[PDB]
Design brief:
The structure is cut from a larger assembly and holds six copies of chain A. Chain A is mostly beta strands. In chain A, 12% of the residues lie in helices and 49% in strands. Chain A contains one helix and six strands, in the order βββββαβ. Chain A has a five-stranded antiparallel β-sheet with strand order 1-2-3-4-5, with no helix packed on it. In chain A, strand 3 and strand 4 form a beta hairpin. Chains in contact: A-B, A-C, A-E, A-F, B-C, C-D, C-E, D-E, E-F. The interface between C and D is large, with 79 and 76 residues. Strand 6 of chain C pairs antiparallel with strand 1 of chain D, so a sheet runs across the interface. It is classed as virus like particle.
Chain lengths: 118, 118, 118, 118, 118, 118
């Protein structure tokens, strides 16, 4: 139960947030608009990028003597024509993620031959 | 209410599925392992990549839904050293996605100053 | 009966908005400052530029409204040295626009010999 | 409460007017027709240009000893396919202008994140 | 009593404001973050910069009564590592400012053997 | 409550003080005068600089528990022509400082659309 407050940042397109408790855990959201034209017609391509990271100490069996840290991260990206419906690709993506997020650190990729979407 | 069946493709430690009824909607899951060495210590880095896309007919002039197709896609990526705990990173990422999910196609950026979690 | 929301673009001291319901209709406002030096004296010149455009499907043969799109646009520009009074210039410009507004798309020029103001 | 009478001018496409009281304040309206053809089809592009200017003396704090003058100007331009409807781009442009015309000389561009159109 | 309205700036790191009555009187706020890497531990260093200026005109007698304009400004700067306590340096700075504030425009300075802090 | 005792400085333009309790916490006051020659009239420009710092130690875990020391500081600067009125730029700067003061050590910043001045 915490909240991520917006950080001072240089870019206007990117919003950066840090966790109130641990200002080492951060999150970043960015939106990009692109233009793709066929002949005379032109359509907008909206791209979203959300990145949540925190540092994690490399050495589990060490005495935690400020061992060099590696970023641990979870990222989300979205690219779609304006006013398209991501509802179904999101449902599918979330269903797939549910199979992995238990084993997101365990180097074990189960052979799944079909994924059921709710 | 549907299932993504593994497509008749060569498994490359990358598993690609297509939706049973709409085979235009696809989804791919891969896990890879890297080795990060800092001095004497070496640690394994688990990297998951899930992608869920469908083609979208460009909003066009015709009453019939006919036009060039642009891919729309939602992508989730995850990189962390082995046996780390991404629980809080995932929680924050999911809260942010909950905020931006309706606006994934909006072309307007909502300026929020804090993101409440858990 | 609608509002122009500022689009998710990088502010360049130029503000670009799109219409909320019809995001094809856009509008841009910029203000710039110049310095005009005549001999010893230097004065600041304020320059405003407002642009309001929408795409227009070319009048075509099909019953469906499908054809190449040409931009239609109305643009207002204003340049004056700082603290000047453009009240009367604006008044005359507005009277002229009132005369020509119905004929902005006419391909016929109305020959008027005087323009009444205020 | 004045009127702009037509001036003697050389061009037939451009109508030039001067204010009766001050023949130093002037106004000019021009209409141009262009042709844009796709394949066999061809369409007219009607362009209107209205320019209202007056000279203004540079030096505010001077004794008004015929200081060199700079033109202060307000301009309007219109470009659209024949028989298109500028009604909405005009409404938007006028709404935007209303925010600037108070501060048309004051070098201050307020950050506006949305413009409401009547 | 007045309000500092936010001006439209291209840079998102700096927020600029102008007084509603006098748009010549302005104020800028900027926060920036620096990383100080000591060994394998990086610490965050927060710098704040507030500036409040307005143009003052130096009247000099002249056949043509226009004199130059030079800004008068009050600036505040701050720099400290994250989660440090500025309470006491603020109190001391404010007491010194209290001594000098009356005489900011006066070119007088007297030896002060001690400054009493609240 | 404490007293800033005057330290013994070689330069007479700058007066330096140290807190009686902590001689590590210091404060400097300096006033300087500049001449701005416009034609045959020279005008006096008063600049004030107050600085209040103290050393803060960044604790980093290490086999040998000694971390580096970096200063935390609050700075005030002022510059204006003689006999000008800073009252309003001071009020505005103080209101902005009032907003940012709590968050001087926090690395958080939220968009503020206006600052209300007393």
């Amino acid at each position: 139960a915490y909240k991520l407050i917006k950080m001072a940042g240089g870019n206007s397109a990117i919003q950066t947030y840090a966790r109130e408790d641990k200002t080492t855990q951060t999150l970043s959201t960015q939106k990009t608009i692109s233009v793709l034209r066929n002949g005379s017609t032109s359509t907008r391509i909206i791209k979203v990028h959300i990145n949540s990271t925190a540092p994690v100490t490399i050495n589990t069996c060490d005495p935690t003597k400020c061992g060099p840290t590696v970023p641990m991260g979870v990222s989300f990206k979205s690219s779609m024509p304006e006013d398209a419906d991501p509802a179904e690709v999101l449902k599918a993506a979330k269903a797939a993620l549910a199979l992995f997020e238990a084993n997101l650190n365990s180097a074990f990729n189960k052979n799944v031959d079909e994924i059921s979407v709710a």
